[PDB]
Amino acid sequence: VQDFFRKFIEFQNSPNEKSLQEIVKLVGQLDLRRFNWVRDVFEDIHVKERGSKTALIWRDINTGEEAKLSYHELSLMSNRVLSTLRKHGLKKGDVVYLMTKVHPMHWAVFLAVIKGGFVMVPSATNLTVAEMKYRFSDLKPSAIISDSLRASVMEEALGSLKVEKFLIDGKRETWNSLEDESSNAEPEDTRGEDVIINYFTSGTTGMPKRVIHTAVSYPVGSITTASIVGVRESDLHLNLSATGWAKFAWSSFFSPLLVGATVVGINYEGKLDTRRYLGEVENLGVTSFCAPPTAWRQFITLDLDQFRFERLRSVVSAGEPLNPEVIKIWKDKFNLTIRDFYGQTETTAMVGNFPFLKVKPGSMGKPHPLYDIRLLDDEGKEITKPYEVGHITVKLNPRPIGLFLGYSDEKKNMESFREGYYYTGDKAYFDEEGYFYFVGRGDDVIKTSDYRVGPFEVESALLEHPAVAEAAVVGVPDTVRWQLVKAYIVLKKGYMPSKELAEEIREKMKTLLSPYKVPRIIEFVDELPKTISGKIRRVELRKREEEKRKKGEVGQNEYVF
């Protein structure tokens, strides 16, 4: 059980196809009835074997602060969290919202939750009072944990609920410290199928729902991720990614701590300083770096002769496609291939260009053998022809380990899991050597700037404005953000289409929505293309935008910001 990860860690130091398959087989034979990744892996293969190796190197590029934590200090610090939580009467399964910046105490809380068998809800720091109140309606908090920078937002969204509140940095009235109880509490003997994580994620139909992950799905699924990423024990590993999302669990937390590596974490407020971040990469001698194509696109526009990166060995991308031209520029300069790979909040990494895999540009590589990946056509028959597009699906008998339990929405489960497959809602084709190529969403779900965006959620917030009668939100091609959020608005009788109105509505949306969700374009239209029932055909809104692009024509009341 312990022996498994020691074999895994070796696999990493020189991986290949064949040895991967052995790893695969061995996972199937783990006994995972009672499992707790902190106790069993963190504490019993790292705190014990490398307890005073650096687990985490942290740095805030604004403040300048640095902090360095060994596997020991980190395990202690996390126990003080879990002791403090338990002291405030937190039983197993209790809900804990976690909204903090990148900071050691983030990792700490992660650990305390996993160990204590709590349900953590990662909450992003750019979430609005509105978004947070939505979350509370859907899943009531037993405790919430914030930094002092976003305490007001939680305080306001909470309103008049009893919860236990906690600050990771600084004091605030009726908030508590996390390091003031004893750094000894015991494991919760968790079932491997027990819930530890809920991720609110956007869908194509309704408001965002919780994706449910267990004490093995992420803690042991992340193998697939770690394996594609090619993170080793020797590595100093950084993931450019934010605090409320899956990619952090993926590569800022699980994948590095699985293999006993040194995590590198960098915090910044506001806008990313491309140069400053890359300076901190080189300056801290990171060896493995995962960043999103959004970031990569911005990096390659720097003067890259200002860097050596002698210490950097692995570079990876995920969440959107990776332009062949990006890959090439970075290679020609630093002699490294940015290895793209694929997955969702609902899963771990499912497909990827592994270290040992020859990259074909604009291909996310081949399936990880721990997922049974199939292209299905519209009728749900399996595609076994090259260059034919279909739905990316996961075969459910046997049920892969890294796959979420389901959504907190039983209807959405009925749409996504069926005839013994889970549909990712992504479309692709494969080639003659089994390399997969991402085509796009079969959904109306949007990805601006490596953020998953649900239409209804923006449409909803739009109907909050007195002027707005109807709204349809679609994503439009943009080289920098992949997609832009555009809104079609039908106006109530009484209001007329002006730029000043468009702006007024946008500024309203800024108080209700996460920035990435606030439409960059607004177009007033007399009506929305609809089916006979009255369902919006967001498909045809998109097609129409395309034909308009090819004749460089603006809509009559289309307002760009």
Ligand X SMILES: CC(=O)OP(=O)(O)OC[C@H]1O[C@@H](n2cnc3c(N)ncnc32)[C@H](O)[C@@H]1O
β partners of residue 447? 452
Label residue 284 exposed, middle or buried (CB < 10 Å: 0-12, 13-18, 19+): middle
Q: Return the residue of 131, 426, 444, 558 that touches ligand AMP, per CB under 6 A.
A: 426
3-state secondary structure of 500: helix
Stated as kind and residue range, the H or E segment containing 267 is strand 262-267
Does 511 belong to an annotated binding site? no
According to CB under 6 A, which residues from 186 to 215 bind ligand AMP? 201
Which of 37-45, 199-207, 313-321, 469-477 is the region at the interface with ligand X (rule: CB under 6 A)?
313-321
According to CB under 6 A, which residues from 439 to 478 bind ligand X? 441, 447, 452
- By beta-carbon proximity to ligand AMP, the closer residue of 447 and 508 is 447
> Least distance (Å) from ligand AMP to the CB of residue 404?
10
Distance (Å) of CA 284 to CA 57, 123, 198, 205, 254: 9, 28, 33, 44, 21
β partners of residue 60? 267
Distance (Å) of CA 415 to CA 199, 278, 454: 19, 42, 16
Per-residue x/- mask for ligand AMP, residues 230 to 269, rule CB under 6 A? ----------------x-----------------------
Does 493 belong to an annotated binding site? no
432 binds, among ligand X, ligand AMP, its own copies, none (CB under 5 to 8 A by kind): none
Per-residue x/- mask for its own copies, residues 399 to 438, rule CB under 8 A? ------xxxx-xx-x-----x-------------------
Which of 18-26, 226-234, 422-430, 546-554 is the region at the interface with its own copies (rule: CB under 8 A)?
546-554
- Is position 168 an interface residue for its own copies (rule: CB under 8 A)? yes
Q: Return the residue of 438, 488, 516, 524 that touches ligand AMP, per CB under 6 A.
A: 438
Does 206 belong to an annotated binding site? yes
According to CB under 8 A, which residues from 331 to 360 bind its own copies? 332-333
532 binds, among its own copies, ligand AMP, ligand X, none (CB under 5 to 8 A by kind): its own copies
According to CB under 6 A, which residues from 323 to 362 bind ligand AMP? 340, 342, 344-345
Alpha helices in 139-270, H assignment, sequence order: 151-158, 217-229, 246-247, 255-258
State residue 377 phi and psi, 5-degree precision: -85, -170
HSE of 552, CA atoms in CB hemisphere, 13 A: 0
Does 210 belong to an annotated binding site? no
Which of 128-136, 192-200, 317-325, 366-374 is the region at the interface with ligand X (rule: CB under 6 A)?
317-325
> Least distance (Å) from ligand X to the CB of residue 95?
40
> Across the beta sheet with 366-367, what order do the strands follow?
66-70, 54-60, 262-267, 236-239, 288-290, 314-318, 338-342, 351-352, 366-367
- Is position 318 an interface residue for ligand AMP (rule: CB under 6 A)? yes
CA 510 – CA 521 distance, rounded (Å): 13
> Least distance (Å) from ligand X to the CB of residue 414?
19
Q: Return the residue of 15, 104, 219, 321 that touches ligand AMP, per CB under 6 A.
A: 321
State residue 21 phi and psi, 5-degree precision: -55, -40
> Least distance (Å) from its own copies to the CB of residue 19?
33
CA 261 – CA 5 distance, rounded (Å): 13
Residues 6+ apart with CB under 8 A from 304: 329, 330, 333, 334
- By beta-carbon proximity to its own copies, the closer residue of 25 and 172 is 172
CA 225 – CA 393 distance, rounded (Å): 18
- Is position 262 an interface residue for ligand X (rule: CB under 6 A)? no
CA 345 – CA 310 distance, rounded (Å): 33
Q: Return the residue of 39, 88, 133, 441 that touches ligand AMP, per CB under 6 A.
A: 441
- Is position 305 an interface residue for its own copies (rule: CB under 8 A)? yes
According to CB under 6 A, which residues from 324 to 383 bind ligand X? 340-345, 364
**Both structure tokens of 50:** 């490398």
- By beta-carbon proximity to its own copies, the closer residue of 22 and 504 is 504
SS3 assignment for 380-413: CCECCCCCCCEEEEEECCCCCCCCCCEECCHHHH
Detail the residues annotated as belonging to a binding site for substrate: 345, 452
Q: Which residues bind ligand X (CB under 6 A)?
A: 318-321, 340-345, 364, 424, 426, 438, 441, 447, 452
